[PDB]
């Protein structure tokens, strides 16, 4: 629907994906159709980035949620600085938060089981503020993203 560009829905998508990466999906009714489609395509992107940029990703130490947030904001800002928005770029936002939570799990100085909820929050903040209008104009998650990325 059109309200799926609001923060709450995006936050749930970002949290769903981190729980997917961390292998702790919550035993509710299950992730939404949107999330189920997003998890497969974002993970495929994530594993390709971690491979080709392995040596690159070993030069930064995500020791805290603050380092993850500034690193996320910095990298994402430069990715979208040309003003272009598309579903592929939005997918890479989720892929990158998955890269960050994996590094946090290993390197976080004081690990906290709620940390991935803080990551999901500033991920959703970025998506809403920088792509929310574009998402709505292109059908939202249900009528835009899912229609283009769901199985043939």
């Amino acid at each position: 629907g059109m309200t799926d560009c609001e923060f709450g829905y995006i936050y749930r998508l970002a949290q769903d994906y981190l729980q997917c990466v961390l292998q702790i999906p919550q035993p509710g009714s299950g992730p939404s159709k949107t999330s189920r489609v997003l998890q497969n395509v974002a993970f495929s992107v994530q594993k390709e980035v971690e491979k080709n940029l392995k040596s690159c990703l070993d030069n930064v130490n995500v020791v805290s949620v603050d380092t993850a947030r500034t690193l996320f904001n910095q990298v994402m800002e430069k990715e979208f600085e040309d003003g272009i928005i598309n579903w592929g770029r939005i997918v890479t936002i989720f892929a990158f938060e998955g890269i960050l939570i994996k590094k946090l799990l290993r390197q976080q100085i004081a690990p906290d089981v709620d940390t991935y909820k803080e990551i999901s929050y500033f991920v959703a903040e970025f998506i809403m503020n920088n792509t929310g209008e574009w998402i709505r104009q292109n059908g939202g998650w249900e009528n835009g993203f899912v229609k283009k990325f769901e199985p043939k």
Partner: peptide, 23 residues
């Protein structure tokens, strides 16, 4: 330098997978 390499590769792979043209 690091943050530019990450931003570049993400932008590349983004516009790459973006050609999921369906519906």
């Amino acid at each position: 330098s690091l943050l530019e390499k990450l931003a570049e590769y993400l932008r590349q792979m983004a516009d790459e997978i973006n050609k999921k043209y369906v519906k």
